Each structure stands twice: as structure tokens, then as C-alpha cells.
Write an enzyme that holds these catalytic residues in place. Sequence first.
Site, PDB file in Angstrom:
ATOM      1  N   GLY A   1       0.697  -1.142  -0.193  1.00 15.55           N
ATOM      2  CA  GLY A   1      -0.048  -0.226   0.282  1.00 15.55           C
ATOM      3  C   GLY A   1       0.868   1.213  -0.067  1.00 15.55           C
ATOM      4  O   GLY A   1       0.118   2.336   0.216  1.00 15.55           O
TER       5      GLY A   1
ATOM      6  N   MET B   1       6.185   4.109  -4.289  1.00 18.77           N
ATOM      7  CA  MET B   1       7.514   4.129  -4.312  1.00 18.77           C
ATOM      8  C   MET B   1       7.892   5.027  -5.526  1.00 18.77           C
ATOM      9  O   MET B   1       7.696   4.722  -6.612  1.00 18.77           O
ATOM     10  CB  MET B   1       8.141   2.759  -4.624  1.00 18.77           C
ATOM     11  CG  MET B   1       9.793   2.495  -4.682  1.00 18.77           C
ATOM     12  SD  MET B   1      10.030   0.765  -4.967  1.00 18.77           S
ATOM     13  CE  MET B   1      11.916   0.548  -4.948  1.00 18.77           C
ATOM     14  N   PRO B   2       9.080   5.831  -5.608  1.00 19.76           N
ATOM     15  CA  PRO B   2       9.522   6.667  -6.527  1.00 19.76           C
ATOM     16  C   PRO B   2      10.077   5.935  -7.448  1.00 19.76           C
ATOM     17  O   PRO B   2      10.846   5.144  -7.260  1.00 19.76           O
ATOM     18  CB  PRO B   2      10.323   7.860  -6.005  1.00 19.76           C
ATOM     19  CG  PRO B   2       9.899   7.913  -4.427  1.00 19.76           C
ATOM     20  CD  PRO B   2       9.935   6.294  -4.169  1.00 19.76           C
ATOM     21  N   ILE B   3       9.543   6.186  -8.903  1.00 19.54           N
ATOM     22  CA  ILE B   3      10.284   5.661 -10.010  1.00 19.54           C
ATOM     23  C   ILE B   3      11.588   5.684 -10.471  1.00 19.54           C
ATOM     24  O   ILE B   3      12.242   4.695 -10.972  1.00 19.54           O
ATOM     25  CB  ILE B   3       9.151   5.136 -11.239  1.00 19.54           C
ATOM     26  CG1 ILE B   3       9.285   6.786 -11.763  1.00 19.54           C
ATOM     27  CG2 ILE B   3       7.885   4.834 -10.896  1.00 19.54           C
ATOM     28  CD1 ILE B   3       8.367   6.511 -13.112  1.00 19.54           C
TER      29      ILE B   3
ATOM     30  N   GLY C   1      15.364   6.511  -8.694  1.00 22.10           N
ATOM     31  CA  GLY C   1      16.260   6.410  -7.432  1.00 22.10           C
ATOM     32  C   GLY C   1      17.546   6.645  -7.990  1.00 22.10           C
ATOM     33  O   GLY C   1      17.972   6.497  -9.216  1.00 22.10           O
ATOM     34  N   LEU C   2      18.498   7.180  -6.838  1.00 25.13           N
ATOM     35  CA  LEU C   2      19.847   7.305  -6.934  1.00 25.13           C
ATOM     36  C   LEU C   2      20.703   5.888  -6.534  1.00 25.13           C
ATOM     37  O   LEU C   2      20.538   5.553  -5.632  1.00 25.13           O
ATOM     38  CB  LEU C   2      20.404   8.242  -6.162  1.00 25.13           C
ATOM     39  CG  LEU C   2      21.960   8.683  -6.246  1.00 25.13           C
ATOM     40  CD1 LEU C   2      22.149   9.045  -7.878  1.00 25.13           C
ATOM     41  CD2 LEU C   2      22.334   9.483  -5.186  1.00 25.13           C
TER      42      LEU C   2
ATOM     43  N   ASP D   1      18.929   4.013  -3.448  1.00 27.50           N
ATOM     44  CA  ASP D   1      19.170   2.539  -3.310  1.00 27.50           C
ATOM     45  C   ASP D   1      20.710   2.039  -2.606  1.00 27.50           C
ATOM     46  O   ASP D   1      21.750   2.621  -3.182  1.00 27.50           O
ATOM     47  CB  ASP D   1      19.197   1.776  -4.647  1.00 27.50           C
ATOM     48  CG  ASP D   1      19.473   0.395  -4.477  1.00 27.50           C
ATOM     49  OD1 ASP D   1      18.642  -0.367  -4.294  1.00 27.50           O
ATOM     50  OD2 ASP D   1      20.597  -0.187  -4.986  1.00 27.50           O
TER      51      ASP D   1
ATOM     52  N   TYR E   1      27.940  -2.448  -0.055  1.00 20.94           N
ATOM     53  CA  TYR E   1      28.801  -1.434  -0.643  1.00 20.94           C
ATOM     54  C   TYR E   1      29.627  -0.361   0.019  1.00 20.94           C
ATOM     55  O   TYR E   1      30.469   0.296  -0.500  1.00 20.94           O
ATOM     56  CB  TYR E   1      27.495  -0.521  -1.242  1.00 20.94           C
ATOM     57  CG  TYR E   1      26.551  -0.958  -2.366  1.00 20.94           C
ATOM     58  CD1 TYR E   1      26.679  -2.373  -2.967  1.00 20.94           C
ATOM     59  CD2 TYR E   1      25.450  -0.360  -2.721  1.00 20.94           C
ATOM     60  CE1 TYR E   1      25.722  -2.853  -3.805  1.00 20.94           C
ATOM     61  CE2 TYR E   1      24.417  -0.972  -3.501  1.00 20.94           C
ATOM     62  CZ  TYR E   1      24.768  -2.241  -4.039  1.00 20.94           C
ATOM     63  OH  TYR E   1      23.927  -2.689  -4.905  1.00 20.94           O
TER      64      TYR E   1
ATOM     65  N   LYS F   1      19.535  -3.740   1.519  1.00 21.78           N
ATOM     66  CA  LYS F   1      19.622  -5.105   1.013  1.00 21.78           C
ATOM     67  C   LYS F   1      20.436  -5.879   1.963  1.00 21.78           C
ATOM     68  O   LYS F   1      21.507  -5.425   2.659  1.00 21.78           O
ATOM     69  CB  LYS F   1      20.298  -5.236  -0.287  1.00 21.78           C
ATOM     70  CG  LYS F   1      19.769  -4.198  -1.454  1.00 21.78           C
ATOM     71  CD  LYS F   1      19.988  -4.687  -2.502  1.00 21.78           C
ATOM     72  CE  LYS F   1      19.873  -3.186  -3.669  1.00 21.78           C
ATOM     73  NZ  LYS F   1      21.001  -2.465  -3.411  1.00 21.78           N
TER      74      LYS F   1
ATOM     75  N   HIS G   1      19.377  -9.579  -1.014  1.00 20.62           N
ATOM     76  CA  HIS G   1      20.316  -9.086  -1.999  1.00 20.62           C
ATOM     77  C   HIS G   1      20.396  -9.821  -3.247  1.00 20.62           C
ATOM     78  O   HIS G   1      20.192  -9.435  -4.221  1.00 20.62           O
ATOM     79  CB  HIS G   1      21.655  -8.521  -1.423  1.00 20.62           C
ATOM     80  CG  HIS G   1      22.390  -7.502  -2.082  1.00 20.62           C
ATOM     81  ND1 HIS G   1      23.153  -6.425  -1.748  1.00 20.62           N
ATOM     82  CD2 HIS G   1      22.282  -7.444  -3.572  1.00 20.62           C
ATOM     83  CE1 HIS G   1      23.627  -5.955  -2.713  1.00 20.62           C
ATOM     84  NE2 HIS G   1      23.236  -6.213  -3.697  1.00 20.62           N
TER      85      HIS G   1
END
EC number: 1.1.1.21
Length: 315
Positions: free
Chosen positions: A9, A12-14, A16-17, A43, A48, A77, A110
Site C-alpha cells: 500500500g 515508491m518513486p520510480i 532512484g539514485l 538505493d 557497498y 539489502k 540481495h
Amino acid sequence: ASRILLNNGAKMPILGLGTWKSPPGQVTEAVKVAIDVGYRHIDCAHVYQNENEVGVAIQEKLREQVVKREELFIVSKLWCTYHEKGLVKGACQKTLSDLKLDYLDLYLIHWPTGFKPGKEFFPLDESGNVVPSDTNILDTWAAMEELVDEGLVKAIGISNFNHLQVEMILNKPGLKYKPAVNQIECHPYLTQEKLIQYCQSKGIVVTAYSPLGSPDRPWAKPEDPSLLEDPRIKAIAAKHNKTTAQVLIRFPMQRNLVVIPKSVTPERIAENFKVFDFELSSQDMTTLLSYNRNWRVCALLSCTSHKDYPFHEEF
Ligand SMILES: NC(=O)c1ccc[n+]([C@@H]2O[C@H](COP(=O)([O-])OP(=O)(O)OC[C@H]3O[C@@H](n4cnc5c(N)ncnc54)[C@H](OP(=O)(O)O)[C@@H]3O)[C@@H](O)[C@H]2O)c1
Ligand SMILES: O=C(O)COc1cc(Cl)ccc1C(=O)NCc1cccc([N+](=O)[O-])c1
């Protein structure tokens, strides 16, 4: 629209960075610039090794009241050495502490491949094979579900799961929450039509990673194709008065995908966001799909005998 509705519900922004390979000494400024020019989705991943620095930027723009927490969509992740039931909450909490957040908007498994826990991200045997974990994806998923029920994450999902593996989770006995997202490699040389329609038919939103072909991937070779230099894509861009990267970013957007281009270059961070004011034609879209070559940035030889290695299957 700038956001897509998930099966939890939430929106989410389509765009991302991405942050994989973003140097720790530059990613703070990169994320600050991205938020300043409109990005609301970042992201991230523990593996990382730069979540602390990404977190410094998020906190600073919250403090500055450039953005509110509710307006941000932060993704991270679960690394492969943390698939064991007893290790998932800690791994999530380490990411939250580094990101200086009290919740994640989305937390993903991940890779489907679990590895032996320890300090090493890729534990290896003497012959260079990765040492697996005997944990399976369904027990790992149950641990992800607990994170939702503890309020540490608002949505859970998966990444680099093939259609049989998605299917296994959807058919998990006792399943409490469906995966919200499947984050997978996707670009005109790996168009992923079968796996994408499977996921969308189940209400699973797909995020496209390496949309520019990851030119900075550390294992790049000369023989490799190069999306950004493909004259056929350059020509579509020219026609639309946009850059090649802008076309590579708009392409997944029109397939109803989320996309996460990485940059630490302020000018490219801004350019990459200026993709909401033009449209590729159906013909352009089918033309870009025709460049598929099943070429993958992300696959590791060290993992190819792991039982859950995702890329032996067709899709
Ligand atoms: N789930 C997973 O397994 C997985 C795997 C891979 C990637 N991902 C996520 O997906 C993100 C994106 O993938 P990626 O980092 O592999 O690669 P990518 O976004 O396809 O490409 C990044 C490369 O493109 C360059 N670039 C960016 N914008 C450009 C532009 N407008 N013009 C020319 N070059 C441009 C960047 O350079 P500069 O930075 O120097 O500007 C960098 O070298 C990652 O960062 C990570 O967040 C997830
Ligand atoms: O995974 C990503 O998000 C990007 O790739 C990275 C990033 C870092 Cl920091 C370290 C290592 C990798 C990488 O080799 N990923 C490929 C990979 C990993 C695990 C299993 C597999 N597999 O194929 O089973 C493949």
C-alpha cells in the site's frame, strides 16, 4: 506519475539514485545534490560499504528541512553472509544505524545465494568456490517478514531471484507478506521480458538496476558491448533532443519499472532526473527491446555451483 503503488500500500518513486561504487568520500555530496534536485529514493546496500556516508547526507537534508522522512524512500539489502535467521535483525539494524534511520522503506534479500557467515562478504574455499550457507530462501523470507512485524522496515522484497525462485516464495507455506519488489538487472542488452511479465502479473514491482550498463563495473572488459556508446541508442536520443543516458533511464520507466541509475557526478545526477518531460514512442520502445543480447553485468563465476545460483535457468 512519479511513484508506483506497491502491494504493501505504499508508493515508491520510480527514479532512484544508485550507490554501488560511489566512493565514500564523494557519496555524501552526491546524495545531497540528488535530494536537492528532486530525488526521493536512494538505493543502498551494506555490501557497498558506504551506508554511513549515505546516511550523513540523508540526515543533513532532514535536519536542513529540505525533505521530510515520509517523503523519502530508502532501500537497502541483506547481504548473503546474513541469511541465517539469527543474523537478519542485526544486519538490518546495522544498516539502519549507518543510514541513521529508524526504519527502511524497503529491505531486499540481495541475492538468493546464502554464504557462510563471518567477516568475509565472499567466504571462499581453497579453490575459489564460494562457501554456501545451508539456509534456504523460504526461512530467510520468514526472517524478513519478522522485520516488518517489528516496525524496522515498511516493505520487504527480493533481488536477483529468477522466476522459479519468486515462485517458491509466492508458494511458501504460511506466507505472510508477498515480496513487494524484485530488483533485477535490466537494460536494452538484457531486456528481461519473461521475468518482468511474471513479476508484474503477480503484483510484484520490478526495479531495474545497471540501466546504463554499469560502465564503472570493476570487471569490465574491452569486448563488452557499451550501451552508452551504441550508435543506435544515440540516434534515438538525438531524435528526442535528450542524452543517451536519459533515453536509457526513460526506457524502463515506460515498462512500468523503477530505475536506479548511479552517479557521483553532480551534472549527471541532475541530468539523469530530467526524464519526466518526454516520451519514447511505442516504436522506440520496441526498437530498444530488440537490442537484447542476454548480456549480464552481474553474475559471478565463484557462485555458479551454489544451489540457488539464479542464472542457470532461462529466467
Ligand atoms: N541488486 C543488486 O544486485 C544490484 C546490482 C548492481 C547494481 N545495483 C544498484 O543499481 C545501481 C545502478 O547500477 P550500476 O551502478 O551497476 O550502474 P549504472 O547506473 O548502469 O551506471 C553507472 C555508471 O554510469 C555513469 N553515468 C551515470 N550517469 C551518466 C550519465 N548521465 N552520462 C554518462 N555516464 C553516466 C556513472 O558515472 P559517474 O558516477 O562517474 O558519474 C557510472 O560509471 C547501483 O549503483 C546499485 O545501487 C543493484
Ligand atoms: O551485488 C551488487 O549489488 C553489485 O555487485 C557487487 C557489489 C559489491 Cl560491493 C560486491 C560484489 C558484487 C558482485 O559481485 N555482485 C555479483 C554477485 C553477488 C553475489 C552472488 C552472485 N551470484 O551470481 O550468485 C553475483
